[PDB]
């Protein structure tokens, strides 16, 4: 059993660490060049090592760096990120233009 552990974190910086596929069964690192899976660093407000989770391009485009907000994770397993003010809470339905 695992409850949704939610704590407010800082989206500090984007990161990119090289990846290797599990099928390689490598006994060594040996990066497979690069990848389009951009990583986001979630820093705990109470101090600690940044939680660098790997995201897709479409996913990284969904959040903003600097946006302090709630993080929903279960241990080391990333579930979802909860922005305080999502895009549509700024981009409202009533416009002048």
Description:
With 97 residues, the chain is mostly beta strands. It has one domain (1-97): OB fold (Dihydrolipoamide Acetyltransferase, E2P). It has one helix and five strands, in the order βββαββ. The chain has one helix at residues 57-60, and strands at 5-15, 39-44, 51-54, 69-74, 77-82. Strands 3-2-1-4-5 form a five-stranded antiparallel β-sheet, with no helix packed on it. A hairpin with a 2-residue loop joins β4 (69-74) and β5 (77-82). It is globular. Keywords: Membrane, Transmembrane, Transmembrane helix. It comes from Salmonella typhi. Residues 13-26 have a biased composition (Basic and acidic residues). Residues 11-37 are annotated as: Disordered. This is DUF2500 domain-containing protein. The PDB classes it as structural genomics, unknown function.
Structure summarized in a few sentences:
The chain has 97 residues and is mainly β. It has 1 helix and 5 strands; from the N terminus they run βββαββ. Strands 3-2-1-4-5 form a 5-stranded antiparallel β-sheet, with no helix packed on it.
């Amino acid at each position: 059993m695992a409850p949704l552990q939610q704590k407010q974190v800082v989206v500090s910086n984007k990161r990119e660490k090289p990846v290797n596929d599990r099928r390689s069964r490598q006994q060594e690192v040996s990066p497979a060049g690069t990848s389009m899976r951009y990583e986001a660093s979630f820093k705990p407000l109470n101090g600690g090592l940044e939680k660098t989770f790997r995201l897709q391009a479409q996913q990284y485009h969904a959040l903003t760096v600097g946006d302090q907000g709630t993080l929903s994770y279960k241990g080391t397993r990333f579930v979802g990120f909860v922005s305080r003010t999502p895009d549509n809470e700024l981009e409202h339905h009533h416009h002048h233009h």
